[PDB]
Amino acid sequence: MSPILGFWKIKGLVQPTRLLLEYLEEKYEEHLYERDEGDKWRNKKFELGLEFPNLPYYIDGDVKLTQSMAIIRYIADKHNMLGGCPKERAEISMLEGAVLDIRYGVSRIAYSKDFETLKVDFLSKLPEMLKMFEDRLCHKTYLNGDHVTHPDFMLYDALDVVLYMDPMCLDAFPKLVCFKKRIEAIPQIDKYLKSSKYIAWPLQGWQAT
């Protein structure tokens, strides 16, 4: 059959994956659970055949995956986009785990209570990470070269997110602010963001702060 991706109905960690799939004009159906269907899940949580039930999940009829990072890499690997050799592949991973630092850093807090108190403690160190990227896209169109690569989409995420936390963190960093438009300027990505399938909110679990 044609790919079946599932996860809640938000952005969390599936979005980067959404964008990528979309970017490759891939065919896929979505299983979305609401703010109240939190049990509709609890039921099929096993019925599916995942050796590691969790969210999001992906069934290829060729595979049954859990773990968000594993899902996106797969979709990638099925397009040569993972690498060419040890050196390059470990380079995207580096880029990968780099974009992560931001994102996870965004939730290791967002759910807690001292947000307004811990975000400050984050925002102090935020720019030191962001800039690193800046220097990357200085003489490059996308984090790796002329071709795209999932990390590009994963970054487009961290950014869209942070920019709700403080729409100024990117001024000092110009090239990044172009990377965003550059991405949002890919036909594919456009057709999506302007349609119905696009989830504009929330960024995490409805429960979050």
Ligand X SMILES: N[C@H](CCC(=O)N[C@@H](CS)C(=O)NCC(=O)O)C(=O)O
- The answer to whether residue 120 forms part of the interface with its own copies (CB under 8 A) is no
> Among residues 35, 52, 97, 120, which is the contact residue for ligand X, using CB under 6 A?
97
- The answer to whether residue 102 forms part of the interface with its own copies (CB under 8 A) is no
Shortest reach from residue 100's CB to ligand X, in Å: 6
Nearer to ligand X, 55 or 118 (CB): 55
Q: What are the CA-CA distances from residue 144 to residues 101, 105, 148, 149, 152 (Å)?
A: 18, 23, 7, 7, 8
Nearer to ligand X, 98 or 186 (CB): 98
Number of residues that bind ligand X (CB under 6 A): 9
Contacts of residue 169, Cβ cutoff 8 Å, sequence gap at least 6: 123, 126, 127, 130, 162, 163
> Among residues 21, 65, 137, 189, which is the contact residue for its own copies, using CB under 8 A?
65
Nearer to ligand X, 93 or 141 (CB): 93
Q: Which does 202 bind (CB under 5 to 8 A by kind): its own copies, ligand X, none?
A: none
Shortest reach from residue 54's CB to its own copies, in Å: 8
Neighbours of 35 (CB within 10 A): 12
Contacts of residue 51, Cβ cutoff 8 Å, sequence gap at least 6: 64, 66
**Beta strand residue intervals within the chain, DSSP E:** 4-8, 29-33, 57-59, 64-65
Nearer to ligand X, 9 or 180 (CB): 9
Q: How far apart are CA 155 and CA 30, in angstroms?
A: 23
